[PDB]
Curated annotation (Swiss-Prot):
Superkingdom of the source species: Viruses
Catalysis performed (reactions): Selective cleavage of Tyr-|-Gly bond in the picornavirus polyprotein
Active-site residues annotated for this sequence: 15 (for protease 2a activity), 33 (for protease 2a activity), 104 (for protease 2a activity)
Full-protein interval shown: 869 to 1007 of 2193
Record's subunit section: Homodimer.
Residue numbers binding Zn(2+) 1: 50, 52, 110, 112
Descriptive protein name: Protease 2A
Length: 139
């Protein structure tokens, strides 16, 4: 679990969105596993606007942060799950690092701010949904 809170927006994994997220829907994209809902309170976070390929993510299944080198956002095949059929997930960045299903929502940050959230993983890999291209989150 986890979310990004920026301005009057809440960014979560689309497969973990609640009934309240869908009732306050701003934008969603199944191909990115992202959903953004509106909030009444002002959010705690800053979004990075950069091309960093290193950062640190929070891993809830270890209660620890880990440094990672990650690939640039790209289209990556993701096997079928209870939430989606087998498909290409876009804007996904991979890195070597521990992850389990409940780690989705953990934030990846660089020195400039929030880069994205855990969305996939397996076999010593961890995949992050990028949010740096969503310029409208800042206005
Ligand atoms: C098996 S270790 C693991 C680590 C992190 C996550 C997972 C689960 C996983 O990748 N998916 C299930 C939820 C939706 C995801 C998606 N973005 O399509 C795919 C598994
Ligand atoms: Zn950066």
């Amino acid at each position: 679990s986890g979310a990004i809170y920026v301005g009057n927006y809440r960014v979560v994994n689309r497969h973990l969105a609640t009934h309240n997220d869908w009732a306050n829907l701003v934008w969603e994209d199944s191909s990115r596993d992202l959903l953004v809902s509106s909030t009444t309170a002002q959010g705690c976070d800053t979004i990075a606007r950069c091309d960093c390929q290193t950062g640190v993510y929070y891993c809830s299944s270890r209660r620890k942060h880990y440094p990672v080198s990650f690939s640039k956002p790209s289209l990556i095949f993701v096997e079928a799950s209870e939430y989606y059929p087998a498909r290409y997930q876009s804007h996904l960045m991979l890195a070597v690092g521990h992850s389990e299903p409940g780690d989705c929502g953990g934030i990846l940050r660089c020195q400039h701010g929030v880069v994205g959230i855990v969305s996939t993983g397996g076999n010593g890999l961890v995949g992050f949904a990028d949010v740096r291209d969503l310029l409208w989150l800042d206005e």
